[PDB]
């Protein structure tokens, strides 16, 4: 059924000859391909700026609204060094700070996005007072939603991402580790409790749920949570890593379909969705991180299988976005490239970029938010710009 959701891939797979046009022997993009990426970025940015004039004033979130556009412009500033991008970022940050709703704690869908992005932007503009005020508010945000879920879009790991984002960008421990530690402890406790309650324990020591489904994928599910729990940033003990997280990861691995794709939720039998939010393009992060941490070959094997699924079925009729689109899917190739140093995967990313370079010419669905970071054009632009330096590329608002 995956075939129904994707365009046939029109490209030849890797060989040293097809690859030479895109990058050299060191994996460094050619000047010509770099420029073509840059040219498309500039073109799409014009369309994005115009389109955003019609966007909902009230949505300031990273996922669909203003803070997400600021994330893009902070990135473009880092890639290109044009001060105009920093200025654009400031405008979008100010809009997002007028949109706080106090309903959610995450970087992508709650108030943490505006606050964490503003903290970093203010820091980059040497505005210490504003930066520090945003950090205070970000720290205090914890208190507004105890009993949050554990997942990326609405739950604890989405809040953690915001804290990590500030610390990374300041290059200093602005948010105390003990703040991250207490959240991590709540996540682990919650997972053990639910596994115990439902008698998953023997097969999976941890279990999580969102809107009464055992979601599997990165956005709302297990793969997202375990990817986080395996991160050195969260400082989970070796003890818990081996006794709790590893067997829970293995349980997810065993959910794999014959195709190499993953179900959206435990017991959901449809092999249909090839997205970051649901399926192989989001589960691959858990696999790659599992490999880095546990060094078991099976995780790498599964990751290769993900990449092949995505190579076959990853050019989505849904469009070019990050959450569920070709650009988000392309990031799966980059993560596997960055693990293995296998240029085959850099090549596949470049071909997905080629597809995005024909933006709007395939008859794709128009997204609900056509210009946003996660559904729309801002995210496609983000990917194109990130590809410029492949070894530093990271899926935004998610990958560490
Ligand atoms: N609002 C989305 C459309 C909805 C969508 O694609 N939702 C994702 C989850 S974030 C999904 O996997 N939907 C289920 C499906 O495609 O069958 C957009 O305009 O891009
Ligand atoms: Zn999605």
Author numbering: 0 to 399
Original authors' sentences:
We therefore determined the structure of LanCL1-C264A in complex with GSH (1.79 Å resolution), showing that the structure is near-identical to that of the wild-type enzyme. Hence, to rule out off-target GSH binding effects, all mutants discussed in kinetic and binding studies are in the background of the Cys264Ala mutation.
The addition of the thiol side chain of Cys residues to dehydroalanine and dehydrobutyrine is a process that occurs in all domains of life and is catalyzed by LanC enzymes. In eukarya, the process is intermolecular and involves the addition of the thiol of glutathione to remove electrophilic structures from the proteome, thus preventing dysregulation of cellular processes. The addition of GSH (C-glutathionylation) removes electrophilic Dha/Dhb residues from the proteome. Previous structures of NisC, LanCL1 (23), LanCL2 (20), and the LanC-domain containing CylM all show a characteristic α,α-toroid fold with a zinc ion bound at the top of the barrel by two His residues and a Cys residue.
